[PDB]
C-alpha cells in the first residue's frame, strides 16, 4: 500500500555492479533478488539524481522507485564549496518522492541513503508545494523513514526542511493574504508551537512612531495596509541574561516600487519581498524546535511599498531612529530604509552578533543569480561560520565586499547624511550594503542579500518551481553550531 | 450607435460608473415602460461575492456599480432572456501595472463594451422587439493607489474559482468573470459579452472587424449575417484548449489573469473568460480594435466609434423574427 524509495550508487571501477544502499540490498534480499534482476533487465545504470520505477515487487510496496545516489564516497567538493554526497541524496530522494506522488500514492517510505538527515531534506523539500488556493491539487504524500535506525537524523532533516518550507509558504502566499499583520500572526503561532520559552510582540504603528522609526514609517505610509514591527524572543540560554544573537529581516509584504514604480513584467514576484523576514523568522522557529541553548531575538519591520497621494516622494528627507537623515532619491530602494531603523533597534539588545537578510537588490541577482546568497560582513569569523554551515546544508553563501569605496558613493548626498541610492549604477548590492553599514556600529554584523535566491526554477533540484525560502537551513545550521561552539 | 459613441467619448470624470448607469437608465426608460433598471451598489456586489470585480474597483475612490437592466419584450413573461454583458471600466490607468502616458486618454472608452450592449438593448426596446433581454455591466475605474490590486494577489470569483492577478491591467477579464457567472442565473438562451479587452486584438485585426470568440457556430453565423447588413463587420477568432492551457497553468490559483506568453493575447483572454462560462451559446466580442475611428469608416467622424452597436441590434431584430 505504500511507495518505497531506495538508493543505488554509481558503479566504482573495482565493483562488478553498482551497489545498493543497505536498505536497497536488504529489500532485494526480501524479494529473492527480483529487484536486482529487474534493474538489470531495465537497461542502463542509474546515474546521480535519475530514477526508475518497478511495479509489483512486493505486496506491501506495489511501486518501488530506485534513485541514483552518485558516488558513495562523495564528500566535500572543494570546487563547489558543498558536501556533494548530501546534495546527491537530497536531489535523488526528491526525484523519487515526486515519482511516487505522480502515481497518486499517499504514503512513502524513504531509504536513509547513509545520511537520513539529507534524505529527509530531499523528501520534505522535494514534495512541498503551496497549493492552498487551488481546487486541483496533487495527492498529499506522507513521507517516513524506511527502517527504525536513523530516527534522530531523519527527524532533524524533517525539522530543517520544515523550517525552510515555512519560509517558502510565507514567501509564496499572495500579498493580499500575507499582510504585515497576517505574517506576524503566522510566525507567532509557529514560534509558540515550537517553545514556551518565547515572547512575541506585534508592535503597531503607535509603537513604531514612539520608537522614532521615521525611515521605516516613510515607506509604510504610501499604503493603506497597517505596518507592524515584529519582535520575537526565544529564551533558550540557561542564563537569562546571556546576550542574544539578533536577526533582522526586511518584511516588505509587497514592493510596487512606490512612486519610483516598477515595470509590470513579473512584478507579482514582489510578494516575496518579505523573504528576509521569512527566512530569519523561520530559522528562529526551527532553532526553538531544536531547543538550542541560546538566546535569540528576531526583528522584522513589515509594511507594503505602494504609490498613492501620501507615499514617499523622490528627494524627500527622512530621519532614522539614530538621528541620521536619509535622502530618498529612489522610493524602490525601500528595503534599506526600513532596515536602517531595525538595525538601529537591534543594537539596543547588546547582541553577540547581528545578522540581517533582505531581498534587497536587483544587482545581487545580476551578480550571482541563484548560485549563492551574497554575504557582506565586517567579521571574517562570522563569514567563516556562515560559509562552513553552508557547506553542510548545500544552500551556499558567497562573500561580497564592504569597502569604504562604496560608502563614499552613498554619503555623497545633496540634502542629507546618506543617499538611499548610489551616485552610479555600478555595484548596486555593494552600495546598498554600504548604506546599511552606516546604521551599524556592532563588530560582528552580516548582511545577506537574498534577492538572487528568492526563487527556484530548476537550479536546486529538490525545490519545485516557486519561492525558495533560501537560505533558511544555512541560518539554522549556523545557530546550531554556534550553540555548541 | 450614437448613444454608445456619446457614452464612450465623454471624459471619465463626467462618465463615472454612477453617471453611466443613470444615463442608460433614462434612455431605456424613455424607450419602453416594459423595463426594470437596478443600479446595484457596492453592498450588493459584496453580497453577491463578486470578489474579482471588487478587487479591480477598490484602487479608486470612485464607487463601483453593477448595472442590471431588464427589457420585458416577450409576450410570455417567463420566456428565458437573451443576456448581454459589457465591460464597464470607466477609466483604465492599468492600476499598479500602470500604462504608459501616450494616448492613455483613450482609456475613457474602456466602458465601450457596456456602452454598446446597453445601447443595443435601448434600441431593441425602441424597436418593440418581442423578446426578453437582460443587460449586465460591471462598472468601476482601474486606478493605482494604496489600496489597489497588487500583482500576485489572489481573488475569488463569484463561482468560487481563484484568480492570480499577475497583471492589474488585465482587469476586464476580472470584472467579466463575475458578471459572466451572474449571467448564468437568468437561465439565458444566449450570453453575449463585449469588451475593449486587449491590445492584442487591435494588433490582430485593427478596426477592420470586431473579434468574435464563440462556442456556437449557430451564434457566430447569426452575428456574421447581421454584420453583412449593417456593414459593421465581425470576424471569428479561436476558442481552443491550446489557449486555455496557458491560463490554467498558474502558480498560486485556479487561473492566471495573463498568459504565460505574449503570443495570442486576445485568445488567451477569451480562454480565461471561457473558464467562467458553462452555457452552450456564448459569444465574446473583443472590440478593442474598433473602439475608435480615424477615417476608416467613412461615415464616422474621428473619435469613439460605438461599434458594433448596430450589428447587435440587427442580431436581436432577426432573432426576434427567427
Amino acid at each position: 500500500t505504500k511507495g518505497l524509495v531506495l538508493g543505488i550508487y554509481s558503479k566504482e571501477k573495482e565493483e562488478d555492479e553498482p551497489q545498493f544502499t543497505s536498505a536497497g540490498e536488504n529489500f532485494n534480499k526480501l524479494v529473492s533478488g527480483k529487484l536486482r534482476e529487474i534493474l538489470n533487465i531495465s537497461g542502463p545504470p542509474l546515474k546521480a539524481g535519475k530514477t526508475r520505477t518497478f511495479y509489483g515487487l512486493h505486496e506491501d510496496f506495489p511501486s518501488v522507485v530506485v534513485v541514483g545516489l552518485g558516488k558513495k564516497t562523495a564528500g566535500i567538493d572543494e570546487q563547489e564549496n558543498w558536501h556533494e554526497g548530501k546534495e546527491n541524496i537530497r536531489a535523488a530522494v526528491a526525484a523519487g518522492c515526486r515519482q511516487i506522488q505522480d502515481l497518486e500514492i499517499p504514503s512513502v517510505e524513504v531509504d536513509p541513503c547513509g545520511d537520513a538527515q539529507a534524505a529527509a531534506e530531499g523528501a520534505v523539500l522535494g514534495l512541498y508545494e503551496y497549493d492552498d488556493l487551488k481546487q486541483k491539487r496533487k495527492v498529499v504524500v506522507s513521507a517516513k523513514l524506511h527502517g527504525s535506525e536513523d530516527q534522530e537524523a531523519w527527524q532533524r532533516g524533517v525539522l530543517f526542511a520544515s523550517g525552510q518550507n515555512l519560509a517558502r509558504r510565507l514567501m509564496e502566499t499572495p500579498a493580499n493574504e500575507m499582510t504585515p499583520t497576517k505574517f506576524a500572526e503566522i510566525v507567532e503561532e509557529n514560534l509558540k508551537s515550537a517553545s514556551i520559552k518565547t515572547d512575541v510582540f506585534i508592535r503597531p504603528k503607535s509603537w513604531i512612531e514612539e520608537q522614532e522609526m521615521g525611515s521605516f514609517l516613510s515607506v509604510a505610509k504610501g499604503s493603506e495596509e497597517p505596518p507592524v514591527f515584529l519582535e520575537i524572543h526565544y529564551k533558550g540560554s540557561p542564563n537569562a541574561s546571556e546576550p542574544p544573537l539578533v536577526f533582522v529581516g526586511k518584511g516588505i509584504t509587497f514592493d510596487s516600487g512606490g512612486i519610483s514604480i516598477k515595470a509590470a513584467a513579473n512584478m507579482d514576484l514582489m510578494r516575496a519581498d518579505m523573504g528576509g523576514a521569512a527566512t530569519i523568522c523561520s530559522a528562529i522557529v526551527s532553532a526553538a524546535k531544536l531547543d538550542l541553548p541560546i538566546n535569540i531575538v528576531g526583528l522584522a519591520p513589515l509594511c507594503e511599498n505602494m504609490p498613492s497621494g501620501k507615499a514617499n516622494k523622490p528627494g524627500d528627507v527622512v530621519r532614522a531612529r539614530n538621528g541620521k537623515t536619509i535622502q530618498v532619491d529612489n522610493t524602490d530602494a525601500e528595503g534599506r530604509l526600513i532596515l536602517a531603523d531595525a538595525l538601529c533597534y537591534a543594537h539596543t539588545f547588546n547582541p553577540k552578533v547581528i545578522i540581517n537578510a533582505a531581498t534587497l537588490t536587483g544587482a545581487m541577482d545580476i551578480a550571482l543569480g541563484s548560485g549563492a546568497t551574497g554575504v557582506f560582513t565586517n567579521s571574517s569569523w562570522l563569514w567563516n561560520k556562515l560559509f562552513e554551515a553552508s557547506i553542510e546544508t548545500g544552500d551556499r553563501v558567497w562573500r561580497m565586499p564592504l569597502f569604504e569605496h562604496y560608502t563614499r558613493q552613498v554619503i555623497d548626498c545633496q540634502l542629507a547624511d546618506v543617499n538611499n541610492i548610489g551616485k552610479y549604477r555600478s555595484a548596486g548590492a555593494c552600495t546598498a550594503a554600504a548604506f546599511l553599514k552606516e546604521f551599524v556600529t556592532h563588530p560582528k554584523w552580516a548582511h545577506l542579500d537574498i534577492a538572487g535566491v528568492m526563487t527556484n526554477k530548476d537550479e536546486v533540484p529538490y525545490l519545485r518551481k516557486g519561492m525558495a525560502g533560501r537560505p533558511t537551513r544555512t541560518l539554522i545550521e549556523f545557530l546550531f553550531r554556534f550553540s555548541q561552539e | 450607435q450614437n448613444l454608445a459613441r456619446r457614452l464612450m467619448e465623454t471624459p471619465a470624470n463626467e462618465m463615472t460608473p454612477t453617471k453611466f448607469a443613470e444615463i442608460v437608465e433614462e434612455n431605456l426608460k424613455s424607450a419602453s415602460i416594459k423595463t426594470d433598471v437596478f443600479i446595484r451598489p457596492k453592498s450588493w456586489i459584496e453580497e453577491q461575492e463578486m470578489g474579482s470585480f471588487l478587487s479591480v474597483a477598490k484602487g479608486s475612490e470612485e464607487p463601483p456599480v453593477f448595472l442590471e437592466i431588464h427589457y420585458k419584450g416577450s409576450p410570455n413573461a417567463s420566456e428565458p432572456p437573451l443576456v448581454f454583458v459589457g465591460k464597464g471600466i470607466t477609466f483604465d490607468s492599468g492600476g499598479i501595472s500602470i500604462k504608459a502616458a501616450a494616448n492613455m486618454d483613450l482609456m475613457r472608452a474602456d466602458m465601450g463594451g457596456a456602452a454598446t450592449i446597453c445601447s443595443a438593448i435601448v434600441s431593441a426596446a425602441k424597436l418593440d422587439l418581442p423578446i426578453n433581454i437582460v443587460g449586465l455591466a460591471p462598472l468601476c475605474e482601474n486606478m493605482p493607489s494604496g489600496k489597489a490590486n497588487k500583482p500576485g494577489d489572489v481573488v475569488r470569483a463569484r463561482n468560487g474559482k481563484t484568480i492570480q492577478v499577475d497583471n492589474t491591467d488585465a482587469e476586464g477579464r476580472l470584472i467579466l468573470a463575475d458578471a459572466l457567472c451572474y449571467a448564468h442565473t437568468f437561465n439565458p438562451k444566449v450570453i453575449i459579452n463585449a469588451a475593449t479587452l486587449t491590445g492584442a486584438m487591435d494588433i490582430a485585426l485593427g478596426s477592420g472587424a470586431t473579434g468574435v470568440f464563440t462556442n456556437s457556430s449557430w451564434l457566430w453565423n447569426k452575428l456574421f449575417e447581421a454584420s453583412i447588413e449593417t456593414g459593421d463587420r465581425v470576424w471569428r477568432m479561436p476558442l481552443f484548449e491550446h489557449y486555455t492551457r496557458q491560463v490554467i497553468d498558474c502558480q498560486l490559483a485556479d487561473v492566471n489573469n495573463i498568459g504565460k506568453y505574449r503570443s495570442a493575447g486576445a485568445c488567451t483572454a477569451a480562454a480565461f473568460l471561457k473558464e467562467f462560462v458553462t452555457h452552450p451559446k456564448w459569444a465574446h466580442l473583443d472590440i478593442a480594435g474598433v473602439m475608435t475611428n480615424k477615417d476608416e469608416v467613412p461615415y464616422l467622424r474621428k473619435g469613439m466609434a460605438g461599434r458594433p452597436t448596430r450589428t447587435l441590434i440587427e442580431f436581436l431584430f432577426r432573432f426576434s423574427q427567427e
Binding site: 513584467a265 | 497583471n167 491591467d169 476586464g172 479587452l197 486587449t198 491590445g199 492584442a200
Partner: peptide
C-alpha cells in the same frame, strides 16, 4: 491587457 497589454502584449506585454
Amino acid at each position: 491587457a497589454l502584449y506585454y
